Amino acid sequence: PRQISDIKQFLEIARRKDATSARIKKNTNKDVKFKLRCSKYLYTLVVADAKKAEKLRQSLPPDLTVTEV
Amino acid sequence: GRVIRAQRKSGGIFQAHTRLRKGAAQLRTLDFAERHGYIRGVVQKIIHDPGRGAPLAKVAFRNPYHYRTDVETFVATEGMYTGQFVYCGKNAALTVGNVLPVGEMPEGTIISNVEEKAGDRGALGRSSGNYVIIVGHDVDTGKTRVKLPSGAKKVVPSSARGVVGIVAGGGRIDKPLLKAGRAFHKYRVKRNCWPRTRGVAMNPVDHPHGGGNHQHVGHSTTVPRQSAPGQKVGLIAARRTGLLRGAA
Amino acid sequence: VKILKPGKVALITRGRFAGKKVVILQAIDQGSKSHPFGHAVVAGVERYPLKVTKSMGAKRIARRSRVKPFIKVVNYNHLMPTRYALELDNLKGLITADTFKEPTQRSAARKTVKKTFEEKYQSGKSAWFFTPLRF
Amino acid sequence: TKRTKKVGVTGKYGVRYGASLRRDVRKIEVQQHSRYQCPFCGRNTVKRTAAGIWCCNGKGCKKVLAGGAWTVTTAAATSARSTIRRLREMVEV
Amino acid sequence: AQRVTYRRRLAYNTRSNKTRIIKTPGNNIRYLHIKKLGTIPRCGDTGVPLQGIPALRPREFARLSHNQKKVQRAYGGCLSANAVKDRIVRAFLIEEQKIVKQKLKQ
RNA sequence: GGUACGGACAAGGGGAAUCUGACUGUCUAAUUAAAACAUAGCAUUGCGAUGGCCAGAAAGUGGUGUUGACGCAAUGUGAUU
RNA sequence: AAUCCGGUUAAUAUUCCGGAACCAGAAGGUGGAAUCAACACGGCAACGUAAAUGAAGUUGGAGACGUCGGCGGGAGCCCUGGGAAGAGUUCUCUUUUCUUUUUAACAAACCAUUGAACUACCCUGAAAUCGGUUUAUCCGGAGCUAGGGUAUGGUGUUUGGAA
Ligand SMILES: [Mg+2]
Ligand SMILES: [Mg+2]
Ligand SMILES: [Mg+2]
Ligand SMILES: [Mg+2]
Ligand SMILES: [Mg+2]
Ligand SMILES: [Mg+2]
Ligand SMILES: [Mg+2]
Ligand SMILES: [Mg+2]
Ligand SMILES: [Zn+2]
């Protein structure tokens, strides 16, 4: 598992071809984790905002598979 | 009777314990450089050799014919130190640690690890604290006379090499062992020769000294030189016995 | 009586260019704010030219007879001075305490040093300077 | 406080082995555990490592010296060196 | 309290049977079998551990990038900094002495 | 306060001498643990390698010996005094 | 050389399942880096980096090593103060007593802070009125104390894994 600290970095990994799916995890503390499954690693980005989470979810590639936990 | 202990020391459990030993201590193969000139080596390590009183020196020499370095294992002479330069050959200087033909050194010099035959790579005066003294040269048909640690006088060819100085490791035997356990540890790294049961403590089947309703030998313990194995026990071919009062 | 002065050849004893031969350009005996110690500005050979023989072709010799220089500010204590000295034609005032603050001026100074060192290597008046020290 | 009038380091042996044996061991043990002076560096940081081997501490002169079993130098070795030096200096000139 | 067992069939406290205790996300106390500790390379002249290089088992060094296994300097990763400095100065002074002895030989 | 209290448990009896082995150690598995054996210490013996001691049917063979008299081999006595 | 957690069976499990990793070998599938003539830069230095051409030969290192003694840290365990949830006791007393309150391999960044270093090394500087300093007396003009750096780095921290 690897953590991604930049939204720009996370979007670039998603646009890659190995990026199969994404996961949305909503924690009790109103923080949102975006998890990207590549061949070798699972990449998590922690978004501490609901507004930012919505924009990031809309910022994803349209063909990316985003799954809700 | 049965095979006595001395007759069983032919191998097997009586072999030397040699796992912890790093290499035999040898002079260096007598080559062109030593026959005609000298060659320089540098002391890399001075190390303890299990089962040996004297320390050993690992000495690095350049190979004259190939791009490579050859490490030699010498008996360290007292005064030797790591990083010292040692010189071996006919033209080496008369300094402690150098290796020279005995014919190239004056009468009275103190040497160690001396060859019996030119090129045998060291036989005489090797144990800790020991040395050999040059007694004289006979230039016609070059033979050098030396005095050995036992006191014997020996004639070696004046091409047999020797190391200048005394073997390191000093007066080791001056310290009482004080304890069975210390003798145990001394021979544990040597061979299976300790402790020793006395012959008279045995039964007749075990030893010529065995048996009897008191512990006693019975016949004389000075036995002839030409005794068979199994009867060659006690004081073999003794010229005399008893506490000497003034000897030579 | 001052061992370290411009034109003298020294040996670097510490750092990435340890064992590389250098020529002193400026001798700042007193310490400045940057480098508060007795430092020097030097030009040295990062890659010595390779030996060339008569059997070589013309193009091959040109390849082997190249110098990649470096320029550096060095503490005096990281220099071993020698007895040789260089001539230092046009490397007089071109490397001051100001070309180091700019990478552009650094590459420009190195290129200038490369040209003079290389031309100096050909027609060897300082052969010892361009032979690597073996250690 | 003194803690011992005679046995010194040999007090570890208690009453065993005989007084003469403990006294002989005592003289040698004081020698073999002593600090000696390094001639190459001048410090008294020369201690024994196994019977003929005397080492030095510090960043300088990490060398090892071949010496006596219980002391750094023996009288026989010292006498041999001067004998050898005299012989060397008389064929030299 | 919770007691543990070796996770392998090696039943003896050998140097290849090193372990440490972990507490799991199941609230289980159990062993984790771990390797021997690594070793930093040592200087070839002085024996000192060489700076700038991690302590690893020998084959782990095959996975690092080149620069993690060395220092950017002559004999980097093989000699210490002070050993190299002694070698440079010694080589220079000895060569110069060979020059004067050659000059004074004629 | 029961003139009690290391309250169970846990947990040295001590001293004066004689014989003997110095000590720690070792052995008769299944009748002997000792004063026997060993031991440090002391002494004697052989031997400088074309050698001493030991081995093998023999050998272009083995051990001591990765050794060299401050050593290896063979005995005796048994710390010290 | 290299694997962890959770789950699963009547009966196997670091082997099955779910999830998350790692090592070795092969080919070279993309991306990046250096090279306009050649194989990078930074730092006084210790040394640093995302890469940073290196055949033969040589040399060095790791693998790789006893035993006892105390001292310092970490992890798990043990103990303790609150809160919560459930339970035991409740003539009387007991804001009570008991149980649960967990976090792996692996990955990243820090790191003597918060616990354990002036441990090793480097730079400045030049110390007698000698100082520094450990439980244990070692260290210094072969460069002390001090000031500032560099490296070694997890069974530590903050996170990802992961609720
Ligand atoms: Mg009997
Ligand atoms: Mg008989
Ligand atoms: Mg007894
Ligand atoms: Mg019985
Ligand atoms: Mg009985
Ligand atoms: Mg007896
Ligand atoms: Mg007696
Ligand atoms: Mg089962
Ligand atoms: Zn010294």
mmCIF file of N, CA and C in Angstrom, chain E residues 21-102:
data_model
loop_
_atom_site.group_PDB
_atom_site.id
_atom_site.type_symbol
_atom_site.label_atom_id
_atom_site.label_comp_id
_atom_site.label_asym_id
_atom_site.label_seq_id
_atom_site.Cartn_x
_atom_site.Cartn_y
_atom_site.Cartn_z
ATOM 1 N N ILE E 21 7.622 -10.792 19.115
ATOM 2 C CA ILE E 21 6.187 -10.879 19.369
ATOM 3 C C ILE E 21 5.458 -9.777 18.615
ATOM 4 N N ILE E 22 4.390 -10.141 17.911
ATOM 5 C CA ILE E 22 3.451 -9.178 17.350
ATOM 6 C C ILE E 22 2.082 -9.358 18.001
ATOM 7 N N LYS E 23 1.357 -8.250 18.101
ATOM 8 C CA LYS E 23 -0.053 -8.214 18.461
ATOM 9 C C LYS E 23 -0.849 -7.909 17.201
ATOM 10 N N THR E 24 -1.780 -8.775 16.861
ATOM 11 C CA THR E 24 -2.424 -8.718 15.556
ATOM 12 C C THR E 24 -3.740 -7.946 15.615
ATOM 13 N N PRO E 25 -4.342 -7.614 14.452
ATOM 14 C CA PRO E 25 -5.691 -7.027 14.468
ATOM 15 C C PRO E 25 -6.794 -8.042 14.709
ATOM 16 N N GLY E 26 -6.503 -9.055 15.503
ATOM 17 C CA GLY E 26 -7.474 -10.043 15.901
ATOM 18 C C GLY E 26 -7.277 -10.224 17.380
ATOM 19 N N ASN E 27 -6.470 -9.322 17.943
ATOM 20 C CA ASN E 27 -6.041 -9.384 19.338
ATOM 21 C C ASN E 27 -5.350 -10.702 19.664
ATOM 22 N N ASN E 28 -4.514 -11.170 18.754
ATOM 23 C CA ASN E 28 -3.752 -12.389 18.952
ATOM 24 C C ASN E 28 -2.289 -12.043 19.173
ATOM 25 N N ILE E 29 -1.687 -12.683 20.161
ATOM 26 C CA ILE E 29 -0.261 -12.588 20.434
ATOM 27 C C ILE E 29 0.395 -13.785 19.766
ATOM 28 N N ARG E 30 1.378 -13.536 18.908
ATOM 29 C CA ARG E 30 2.049 -14.619 18.205
ATOM 30 C C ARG E 30 3.444 -14.178 17.800
ATOM 31 N N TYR E 31 4.239 -15.153 17.383
ATOM 32 C CA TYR E 31 5.600 -14.894 16.951
ATOM 33 C C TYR E 31 5.617 -14.356 15.532
ATOM 34 N N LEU E 32 6.665 -13.616 15.231
ATOM 35 C CA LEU E 32 7.029 -13.283 13.868
ATOM 36 C C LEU E 32 8.477 -13.711 13.712
ATOM 37 N N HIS E 33 8.751 -14.547 12.725
ATOM 38 C CA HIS E 33 10.109 -15.020 12.514
ATOM 39 C C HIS E 33 10.890 -13.991 11.708
ATOM 40 N N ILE E 34 12.029 -13.577 12.235
ATOM 41 C CA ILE E 34 12.785 -12.475 11.663
ATOM 42 C C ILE E 34 14.201 -12.941 11.368
ATOM 43 N N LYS E 35 14.864 -12.185 10.508
ATOM 44 C CA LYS E 35 16.204 -12.485 10.047
ATOM 45 C C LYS E 35 17.252 -11.964 11.018
ATOM 46 N N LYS E 36 18.483 -12.413 10.806
ATOM 47 C CA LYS E 36 19.627 -11.802 11.461
ATOM 48 C C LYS E 36 19.803 -10.364 10.977
ATOM 49 N N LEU E 37 20.402 -9.543 11.830
ATOM 50 C CA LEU E 37 20.603 -8.132 11.530
ATOM 51 C C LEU E 37 21.712 -7.939 10.493
ATOM 52 N N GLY E 38 21.574 -6.891 9.681
ATOM 53 C CA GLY E 38 22.558 -6.607 8.658
ATOM 54 C C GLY E 38 23.873 -6.106 9.220
ATOM 55 N N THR E 39 24.847 -5.929 8.328
ATOM 56 C CA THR E 39 26.183 -5.465 8.694
ATOM 57 C C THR E 39 26.653 -4.404 7.709
ATOM 58 N N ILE E 40 27.222 -3.323 8.225
ATOM 59 C CA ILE E 40 27.756 -2.254 7.384
ATOM 60 C C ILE E 40 29.110 -2.694 6.839
ATOM 61 N N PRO E 41 29.410 -2.444 5.567
ATOM 62 C CA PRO E 41 30.743 -2.767 5.043
ATOM 63 C C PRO E 41 31.835 -2.047 5.817
ATOM 64 N N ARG E 42 32.995 -2.681 5.898
ATOM 65 C CA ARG E 42 34.102 -2.155 6.681
ATOM 66 C C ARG E 42 35.266 -1.747 5.786
ATOM 67 N N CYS E 43 36.009 -0.745 6.241
ATOM 68 C CA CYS E 43 37.155 -0.251 5.493
ATOM 69 C C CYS E 43 38.197 -1.348 5.305
ATOM 70 N N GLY E 44 38.748 -1.424 4.098
ATOM 71 C CA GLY E 44 39.769 -2.409 3.802
ATOM 72 C C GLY E 44 41.122 -2.119 4.420
ATOM 73 N N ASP E 45 41.378 -0.880 4.829
ATOM 74 C CA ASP E 45 42.660 -0.540 5.437
ATOM 75 C C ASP E 45 42.597 -0.468 6.954
ATOM 76 N N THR E 46 41.497 0.021 7.510
ATOM 77 C CA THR E 46 41.403 0.243 8.941
ATOM 78 C C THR E 46 40.349 -0.600 9.639
ATOM 79 N N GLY E 47 39.454 -1.252 8.908
ATOM 80 C CA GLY E 47 38.415 -2.047 9.524
ATOM 81 C C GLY E 47 37.242 -1.270 10.073
ATOM 82 N N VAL E 48 37.253 0.056 9.980
ATOM 83 C CA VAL E 48 36.160 0.872 10.503
ATOM 84 C C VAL E 48 34.930 0.638 9.637
ATOM 85 N N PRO E 49 33.727 0.709 10.201
ATOM 86 C CA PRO E 49 32.528 0.694 9.362
ATOM 87 C C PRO E 49 32.477 1.926 8.472
ATOM 88 N N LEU E 50 32.048 1.723 7.235
ATOM 89 C CA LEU E 50 32.055 2.774 6.232
ATOM 90 C C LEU E 50 30.767 3.579 6.309
ATOM 91 N N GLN E 51 30.909 4.895 6.324
ATOM 92 C CA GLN E 51 29.790 5.811 6.450
ATOM 93 C C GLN E 51 28.971 5.877 5.164
ATOM 94 N N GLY E 52 27.679 6.143 5.319
ATOM 95 C CA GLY E 52 26.795 6.376 4.200
ATOM 96 C C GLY E 52 26.138 5.151 3.608
ATOM 97 N N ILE E 53 26.281 3.986 4.232
ATOM 98 C CA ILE E 53 25.846 2.715 3.667
ATOM 99 C C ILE E 53 25.048 1.957 4.720
ATOM 100 N N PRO E 54 23.868 1.437 4.396
ATOM 101 C CA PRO E 54 23.044 0.767 5.407
ATOM 102 C C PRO E 54 23.575 -0.612 5.772
ATOM 103 N N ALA E 55 23.098 -1.107 6.910
ATOM 104 C CA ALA E 55 23.456 -2.430 7.406
ATOM 105 C C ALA E 55 22.437 -3.438 6.883
ATOM 106 N N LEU E 56 22.879 -4.316 5.986
ATOM 107 C CA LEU E 56 22.011 -5.295 5.350
ATOM 108 C C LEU E 56 22.702 -6.655 5.314
ATOM 109 N N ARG E 57 21.897 -7.706 5.179
ATOM 110 C CA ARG E 57 22.426 -9.018 4.852
ATOM 111 C C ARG E 57 23.031 -8.981 3.450
ATOM 112 N N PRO E 58 23.981 -9.875 3.156
ATOM 113 C CA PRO E 58 24.781 -9.717 1.927
ATOM 114 C C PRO E 58 23.972 -9.634 0.644
ATOM 115 N N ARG E 59 22.932 -10.450 0.494
ATOM 116 C CA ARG E 59 22.180 -10.473 -0.754
ATOM 117 C C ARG E 59 21.199 -9.317 -0.881
ATOM 118 N N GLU E 60 20.824 -8.688 0.225
ATOM 119 C CA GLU E 60 20.006 -7.490 0.153
ATOM 120 C C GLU E 60 20.722 -6.359 -0.565
ATOM 121 N N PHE E 61 22.055 -6.352 -0.545
ATOM 122 C CA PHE E 61 22.797 -5.326 -1.260
ATOM 123 C C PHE E 61 22.576 -5.412 -2.760
ATOM 124 N N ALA E 62 22.121 -6.558 -3.273
ATOM 125 C CA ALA E 62 21.856 -6.684 -4.702
ATOM 126 C C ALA E 62 20.621 -5.917 -5.148
ATOM 127 N N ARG E 63 19.803 -5.428 -4.220
ATOM 128 C CA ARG E 63 18.573 -4.735 -4.571
ATOM 129 C C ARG E 63 18.675 -3.216 -4.509
ATOM 130 N N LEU E 64 19.687 -2.666 -3.844
ATOM 131 C CA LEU E 64 19.853 -1.221 -3.747
ATOM 132 C C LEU E 64 20.319 -0.620 -5.072
ATOM 133 N N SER E 65 20.068 0.679 -5.232
ATOM 134 C CA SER E 65 20.660 1.417 -6.336
ATOM 135 C C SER E 65 22.152 1.615 -6.079
ATOM 136 N N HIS E 66 22.890 1.926 -7.143
ATOM 137 C CA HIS E 66 24.345 1.947 -7.038
ATOM 138 C C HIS E 66 24.819 2.893 -5.944
ATOM 139 N N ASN E 67 24.267 4.098 -5.899
ATOM 140 C CA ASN E 67 24.807 5.136 -5.035
ATOM 141 C C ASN E 67 24.544 4.872 -3.558
ATOM 142 N N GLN E 68 23.569 4.032 -3.219
ATOM 143 C CA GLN E 68 23.361 3.681 -1.822
ATOM 144 C C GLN E 68 24.429 2.730 -1.295
ATOM 145 N N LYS E 69 25.194 2.094 -2.171
ATOM 146 C CA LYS E 69 26.185 1.111 -1.760
ATOM 147 C C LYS E 69 27.602 1.656 -1.760
ATOM 148 N N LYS E 70 27.772 2.966 -1.894
ATOM 149 C CA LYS E 70 29.091 3.557 -2.068
ATOM 150 C C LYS E 70 29.051 5.017 -1.634
ATOM 151 N N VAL E 71 30.215 5.663 -1.682
ATOM 152 C CA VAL E 71 30.367 7.096 -1.465
ATOM 153 C C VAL E 71 31.053 7.681 -2.691
ATOM 154 N N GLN E 72 30.607 8.864 -3.120
ATOM 155 C CA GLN E 72 31.140 9.514 -4.320
ATOM 156 C C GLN E 72 32.515 10.094 -4.008
ATOM 157 N N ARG E 73 33.525 9.245 -4.150
ATOM 158 C CA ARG E 73 34.920 9.516 -3.844
ATOM 159 C C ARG E 73 35.710 8.291 -4.271
ATOM 160 N N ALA E 74 37.005 8.489 -4.494
ATOM 161 C CA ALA E 74 37.899 7.387 -4.812
ATOM 162 C C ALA E 74 37.854 6.324 -3.719
ATOM 163 N N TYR E 75 37.800 5.058 -4.130
ATOM 164 C CA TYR E 75 37.642 3.923 -3.217
ATOM 165 C C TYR E 75 36.363 4.014 -2.386
ATOM 166 N N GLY E 76 35.374 4.772 -2.850
ATOM 167 C CA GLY E 76 34.123 4.939 -2.131
ATOM 168 C C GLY E 76 33.388 3.637 -1.902
ATOM 169 N N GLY E 77 33.004 3.369 -0.664
ATOM 170 C CA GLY E 77 32.414 2.093 -0.345
ATOM 171 C C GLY E 77 33.407 0.968 -0.145
ATOM 172 N N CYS E 78 34.704 1.241 -0.234
ATOM 173 C CA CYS E 78 35.733 0.229 -0.046
ATOM 174 C C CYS E 78 36.780 0.709 0.955
ATOM 175 N N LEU E 79 37.065 2.006 0.957
ATOM 176 C CA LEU E 79 37.973 2.609 1.922
ATOM 177 C C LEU E 79 37.267 3.747 2.640
ATOM 178 N N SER E 80 37.645 3.971 3.895
ATOM 179 C CA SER E 80 37.125 5.122 4.613
ATOM 180 C C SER E 80 37.748 6.409 4.076
ATOM 181 N N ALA E 81 37.137 7.533 4.448
ATOM 182 C CA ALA E 81 37.605 8.830 3.976
ATOM 183 C C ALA E 81 39.017 9.122 4.460
ATOM 184 N N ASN E 82 39.307 8.827 5.728
ATOM 185 C CA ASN E 82 40.635 9.097 6.265
ATOM 186 C C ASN E 82 41.674 8.123 5.719
ATOM 187 N N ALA E 83 41.269 6.891 5.387
ATOM 188 C CA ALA E 83 42.205 5.948 4.778
ATOM 189 C C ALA E 83 42.607 6.392 3.380
ATOM 190 N N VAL E 84 41.636 6.833 2.581
ATOM 191 C CA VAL E 84 41.915 7.356 1.248
ATOM 192 C C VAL E 84 42.851 8.556 1.324
ATOM 193 N N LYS E 85 42.622 9.444 2.291
ATOM 194 C CA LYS E 85 43.465 10.625 2.444
ATOM 195 C C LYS E 85 44.900 10.236 2.778
ATOM 196 N N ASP E 86 45.081 9.217 3.617
ATOM 197 C CA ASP E 86 46.425 8.727 3.894
ATOM 198 C C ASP E 86 47.072 8.165 2.636
ATOM 199 N N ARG E 87 46.301 7.441 1.822
ATOM 200 C CA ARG E 87 46.833 6.838 0.602
ATOM 201 C C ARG E 87 47.275 7.887 -0.412
ATOM 202 N N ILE E 88 46.470 8.932 -0.600
ATOM 203 C CA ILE E 88 46.811 9.994 -1.544
ATOM 204 C C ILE E 88 48.092 10.695 -1.120
ATOM 205 N N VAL E 89 48.161 11.100 0.144
ATOM 206 C CA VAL E 89 49.339 11.810 0.625
ATOM 207 C C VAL E 89 50.558 10.902 0.595
ATOM 208 N N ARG E 90 50.395 9.644 1.014
ATOM 209 C CA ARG E 90 51.511 8.706 0.988
ATOM 210 C C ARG E 90 51.999 8.465 -0.433
ATOM 211 N N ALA E 91 51.077 8.288 -1.383
ATOM 212 C CA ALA E 91 51.486 8.043 -2.761
ATOM 213 C C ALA E 91 52.256 9.227 -3.319
ATOM 214 N N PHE E 92 51.779 10.441 -3.055
ATOM 215 C CA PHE E 92 52.430 11.627 -3.592
ATOM 216 C C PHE E 92 53.833 11.792 -3.022
ATOM 217 N N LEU E 93 53.965 11.722 -1.697
ATOM 218 C CA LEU E 93 55.265 11.925 -1.067
ATOM 219 C C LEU E 93 56.265 10.852 -1.471
ATOM 220 N N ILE E 94 55.823 9.599 -1.574
ATOM 221 C CA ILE E 94 56.724 8.531 -1.987
ATOM 222 C C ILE E 94 57.173 8.735 -3.430
ATOM 223 N N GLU E 95 56.257 9.144 -4.311
ATOM 224 C CA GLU E 95 56.632 9.389 -5.701
ATOM 225 C C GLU E 95 57.638 10.526 -5.814
ATOM 226 N N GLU E 96 57.439 11.594 -5.039
ATOM 227 C CA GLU E 96 58.379 12.710 -5.039
ATOM 228 C C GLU E 96 59.753 12.280 -4.551
ATOM 229 N N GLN E 97 59.796 11.439 -3.522
ATOM 230 C CA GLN E 97 61.070 10.924 -3.043
ATOM 231 C C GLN E 97 61.753 10.068 -4.100
ATOM 232 N N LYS E 98 60.984 9.287 -4.855
ATOM 233 C CA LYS E 98 61.578 8.538 -5.952
ATOM 234 C C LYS E 98 62.152 9.477 -7.000
ATOM 235 N N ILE E 99 61.564 10.664 -7.146
ATOM 236 C CA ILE E 99 62.059 11.637 -8.112
ATOM 237 C C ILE E 99 63.399 12.202 -7.660
ATOM 238 N N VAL E 100 63.517 12.560 -6.377
ATOM 239 C CA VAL E 100 64.770 13.137 -5.900
ATOM 240 C C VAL E 100 65.870 12.082 -5.890
ATOM 241 N N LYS E 101 65.544 10.851 -5.488
ATOM 242 C CA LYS E 101 66.548 9.794 -5.467
ATOM 243 C C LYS E 101 67.030 9.476 -6.876
ATOM 244 N N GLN E 102 66.148 9.586 -7.865
ATOM 245 C CA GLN E 102 66.587 9.448 -9.247
ATOM 246 C C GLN E 102 67.453 10.627 -9.677
#
